[PDB]
Design a binder for this molecule. Structure first.
Ligand SMILES: Nc1ncnc2c1ncn2[C@@H]1O[C@H](COP(=O)(O)OP(=O)(O)O)[C@@H](O)[C@H]1O
Ligand SMILES: Nc1ncnc2c1ncn2[C@@H]1O[C@H](COP(=O)(O)OP(=O)(O)O)[C@@H](O)[C@H]1O
Ligand SMILES: Nc1ncnc2c1ncn2[C@@H]1O[C@H](COP(=O)(O)OP(=O)(O)O)[C@@H](O)[C@H]1O
Ligand SMILES: Nc1ncnc2c1ncn2[C@@H]1O[C@H](COP(=O)(O)OP(=O)(O)O)[C@@H](O)[C@H]1O
Ligand SMILES: Nc1ncnc2c1ncn2[C@@H]1O[C@H](COP(=O)(O)OP(=O)(O)O)[C@@H](O)[C@H]1O
Lengths: 577, 577, 182
């Protein structure tokens, strides 16, 4: 049976057919110690996709091969007993179980200390069990039959919670994601594999770059793999050039990575330094007024960079102030400059986050219960989007259960769902917004809220939220009244970003509204409660729909001249034909 | 034939090939006495998994083969049967019954007084009767078919209380963890099993401390078995190393174990003694001022130690005073010293209460309570952290019924649950906190608050809480205003902490603030309404904001001279990079 | 739909206010049983006749009430959901929709309780136009309890027609009675 249903990895490994494993020496040492145990001799690797599971198993073979194992294990050998033997080559219920018994008996015979391994224990047990190895295997545990289990933590948890027995037969070994630098070392170990595979030379800077990029381009997959994937892709691109050479940091790899989604200048040019020294000036141009809010945000974001602030915590803010103040524009513009995607952010509508708090909760419905979008609202999105702003809209209405989770992620951001998996997105800036202190911004005590008044704003916060929450937010930020002092030019800022996307620039407007329509829109648009929100609405109707009404006359060649044709707003701005 | 899927334990015992069992002589005698009974003669050990429930049964087998068994039972043999017997061979509805009935009949039919046993009794009755090999037995109890086996107290209640008939068929026998010395004797008994299996010699003292370590280290694990985990794992450690001699006193064990939580040396040190002696002296370096509070703690701790306090319970304090005075800081720092880990603290929100509190406190329950984490907030943390500090946040806000619930910590360390399980605290020091007397501390009568102020505080305490509650407290401790003298050191603590917690050693700072920058920090970071708390935020706002940004701007490559320069707080940092 | 007359001033005010781009939501403040409905029917015809400021040229009138909060409701919070559902549908593109509420007494929620009422200040200055109506006996209490209502709505003083106005109405509706009854 073994010749059909299992692979003698140790012997293959002895011959070659192995990738030298590095950065997992402790996992191997742990595995060896477990296998050596008089009792409870079975280890299990628990990690995530891209972590190094198969390598850990091969690393064990390397120690076996060199007999760099305790006396007990010097006769040990590894066999891959999974997937193909279970379902890919199977047709009916029981095919696996009978084959399994078959190999266990071949294995049980004393053909050296056979140590088996499972690449995916989810394939065993699964759903309904039916003794899919799970009862027979431990039933025969006296006959050596040592085995190394393995799984993602997500499944480990689900499998364990359904069972709880193998959990106490198998020693847990958690396998951590390696540092980017460790990832690079892995890439270096595999450098010649890629060079041979593709026939291209790889520069050391290329390896460094790929690992760094992996952190920055494949947010849902762990670093060894994410980096190795890009390197193989990049090398293949170079091989194509070779076939019609070498692998280089930005010339091949960065662009290859960029080309997986777009990107062409981002990540490559993103040295961060000048965004702070000059990148901050951009938010204050995209968002107008509230310069200190911008600075506060910029500062804290930057503090999370380089782990200067303890890296366990992402920047985190509480945005208090007027609606229509730009508090979310800032969140988006930050995502824009910081990540190059204003819509990468995840919006959390907290006004709906009442007693339901299930699929509607970041953590999701406790796994296994009806309503199986288990973290579909936010966790799953975060797996794909850990490099963006998470924002809580009217967080003051969020159910305490949600607020609790926020606290859990607010610091020590090991974001973990009810699925049993961790996202750990310490790079996700989180913004909570609130109208809680609005009663004090409404005091009008400076368009820029002055001392005491801002303290009353913070006061309201102290009264509503638990101190622990408040003690972990990196800053409370106030979205100061925009006033004429801002909107007199915001209107231009808005009209300009519209121009730039108005007709994809095939045709464009001048729209010189002088002072007259600029003030018309600003004065009738801007609200001291709703801020610029109604202003934007006026632009859509006063200008964009109006311009459309004129273009439908089919009389334009290009540009757009202005003549503001003079109850509230009876003028309607009106630009001339 | 019953042998098809089950084991003759007595015969195994006749052949040896089974660890000898010691330290449970009374349990097995009790078991035997029960078995010898005319009526209601079945036993069932009750405890925790890993407790030795099997070993106790095995000890009985030894008694049979040694004829220490009464003559009515000398004609008996023990036979195990479970899980594989139940499910490996069960494919269709009714297979359970057929497999059991088959066995039961073979036994019933003259062939030896076999005492059948189930080590996982809750499997009988499945998840809710429907004769999941359940009714079957009472019906067959008329054939004697004597049964032993075991249950945890949790599953016991979960199943047995529902079964009812069990209670009139079995005479349950409770079991419990042995002492450490007894465990060591067990370890000595098993010592050669490892010395032979691993080849690793075990120092006598190694066995001794392994058991000690099991309690000092392996939170929720059973002393029985866990102590062996330490022995076997430690031996495996040595075995791997020697082939790449022995297990030494505490050294190899402790490093092998301690590494699982860290704190290596702290665990590998003096058995409290010196820590207890220089508790306050050393604590004063992390907790500044409040010497009396520190002394109070040191004393209670010392009393919880060495059995000086009544061993039936944990020590506790009521920490009264202003937030920011260090009530929690102290509690965390002592969690630090006590458990070598400040994160051990269990934080409890006392204000989140109503008369419907239930799962909200410990594991209390109501109809509809089910949801798995039915109050693990307090109890699972204690389960997982039995060597810890638990703290009540503004205990004055606790509902009186909850203050009563807290009685389970205040005395009588036994802790109940509506899940049918207990926690039973011991080395779980509890701190209750409150601002109940804040208006008296605000008298500011010295940096060492005068007694009449304290009397006002104690008055309020007595007025507010039931005397019964208060009486159980080891000490009620009142915190002083910290003032300049305390923050004079607190700042330095935090400054050092920040670089030490700066990932590793990435920049190093001189932190040479001199009195002036320390005063700056005090001026804008210490407040009588938040005490020293704002110092943290201020340091973030000044030191991290200004220096981190310069680092991030690549202005600060390495090192850093640190101070301030003379609206407000323009003085923040103002340093060359 | 019956013709309405004697309300041209009340209707014109309603139209001017709806046309108004800031405090654009009118409310028929006054004596109950005076044809407040008729004013709305008036508006419903002003649109179509389009004898309105061109602001309302793209507009449409609907009467959103009762079914809106109760008939389509099953449990707590449905007032917000049913209203929100509609508001989303009409927030953009599909004409300059104006809703009429028979009673503003259904606004300010069931003791506010975010019962559609939350959508009110949210939409009060978010297009989503609405015409209210009220009995003065409580109107005064609506504005004292709400505050925002007075700040967000334009009261229109409305009252019963004189006898002469009434007979004009009756004559206008004369054929409606004659036709129905024969
Ligand atoms: N030489 C090596 N050093 C470290 N890791 C390696 C090495 N060679 C292969 N690997 C990794 O083992 C991993 C495959 O296991 P893993 O992704 O963790 O499995 P799964 O998807 O099932 O969780 C890949 O990332 C693979 O590149
Ligand atoms: N420079 C700017 N450009 C465009 N909008 C700005 C700018 N500064 C502030 N704002 C305004 O902030 C408004 C959005 O405010 P916000 O409260 O976050 O949104 P919402 O009210 O839609 O929830 C936008 O309409 C935007 O015009
Ligand atoms: N000499 C001994 N004396 C007491 N207990 C022993 C001895 N030898 C082995 N054991 C016990 O074997 C037990 C295993 O625990 P047990 O509760 O029976 O669970 P399991 O079903 O996992 O074996 C341990 O408690 C261990 O102490
Ligand atoms: N004596 C002290 N030594 C060091 N830090 C202190 C001391 N007293 C107060 N603090 C500060 O106050 C904070 C905790 O305050 P505390 O009163 O114990 O709790 P809380 O204010 O969070 O209710 C700590 O972060 C700590 O920096
Ligand atoms: N001239 C009119 N002809 C017909 N109806 C009129 C006239 N003037 C006012 N009305 C009516 O006043 C009515 C108010 O409706 P009604 O059903 O009586 O409820 P309410 O008790 O709120 O007033 C409207 O239907 C409106 O048409």
């Amino acid at each position: 049976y073994l010749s059909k249903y299992a692979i003698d990895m140790t012997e293959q490994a002895r011959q070659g057919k192995l990738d030298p494993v590095i950065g997992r020496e402790e996992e191997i040492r742990s595995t060896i110690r477990v296998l050596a145990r008089r009792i409870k001799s079975n280890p299990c690797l628990i990690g995530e996709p891209g972590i190094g599971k198969t390598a850990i198993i091969e690393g064990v073979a390397q120690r076996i091969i060199d007999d760099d194992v305790p006396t007990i294990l010097q006769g040990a050998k590894l066999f891959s007993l999974d997937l193909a033997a279970l379902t890919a080559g199977a047709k009916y219920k029981g095919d696996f179980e009978e084959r399994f018994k078959g190999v266990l008996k071949e294995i049980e015979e004393s053909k050296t200390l056979i140590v088996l391994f499972i690449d995916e224990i989810h394939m065993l047990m699964g759903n309904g069990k039916d003794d899919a190895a799970n009862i027979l295997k431990p039933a025969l545990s006296r006959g050596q039959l040592k085995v190394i289990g393995a799984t993602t933590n997500n499944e480990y948890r689900s499998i364990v919670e359904k069972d709880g027995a193998f959990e106490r037969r198998f020693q847990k070994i958690e396998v951590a994601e390696p540092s980017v630098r460790q990832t690079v070392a892995i890439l270096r170990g595999l450098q010649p594999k890629y060079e041979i595979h593709h026939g291209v030379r790889i520069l050391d800077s290329a390896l460094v770059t790929a690992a760094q990029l992996a952190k920055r381009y494949l947010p849902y997959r762990r670093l060894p793999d994410s980096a190795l994937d890009l390197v193989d892709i990049s090398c293949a691109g170079v091989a194509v050039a070779r076939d019609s050479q070498n692998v280089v940091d930005s010339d091949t790899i960065s662009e290859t990575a960029a080309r997986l989604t777009g990107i062409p200048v981002k990540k490559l040019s993103e040295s961060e330094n000048e965004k702070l020294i000059h990148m901050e000036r951009d938010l204050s141009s995209e968002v107008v007024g509230q310069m200190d809010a911008i600075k506060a945000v910029s500062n804290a974001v930057r503090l999370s960079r380089s782990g200067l602030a303890n890296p366990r915590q992402p920047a985190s803010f509480l945005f208090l102030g007027l609606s229509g103040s730009g508090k979310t524009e800032l969140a988006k513009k930050v995502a824009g400059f910081l990540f190059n995607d204003e819509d990468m952010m995840i919006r959390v509508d907290c006004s709906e986050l009442s007693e339901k708090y299930a699929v509607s909760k970041l953590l999701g419905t406790t796994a296994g219960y009806v309503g199986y979008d288990e973290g579909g609202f936010l966790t799953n999105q975060l797996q794909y989007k850990p490099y963006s702003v998470l924002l809580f809209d009217e967080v003051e209405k969020a159910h305490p259960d949600v607020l609790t989770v926020m606290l859990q992620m607010l610091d020590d951001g090991r974001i973990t769902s009810g699925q049993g998996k961790t996202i750990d997105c310490s790079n996700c800036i989180v913004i909570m917004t609130s109208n809680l202190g609005a009663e004090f911004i409404n005091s009008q005590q400076g368009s820029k809220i002055q001392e005491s008044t801002k303290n009353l704003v913070m006061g309201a916060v102290r009264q509503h939220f638990r101190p622990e929450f408040l003690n972990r937010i990196s800053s409370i930020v106030i979205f100061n009244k925009l006033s004429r002092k801002a909107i007199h030019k915001i209107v231009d800022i808005r009209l300009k970003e519209i121009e730039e996307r108005f007709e994809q620039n095939d045709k464009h407007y001048k729209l010189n509204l002088t002072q007259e329509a600029k003030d018309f829109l600003a004065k009738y648009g801007y609200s001291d409660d709703m801020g610029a929100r109604p202003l934007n609405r006026l632009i859509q109707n006063e200008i964009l729909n109006k311009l459309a009404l004129r273009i439908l006359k089919n009389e334009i060649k290009d540009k757009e001249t202005v003549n503001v044709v003079l109850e509230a707003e009876e003028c309607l701005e009106v630009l001339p034909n």
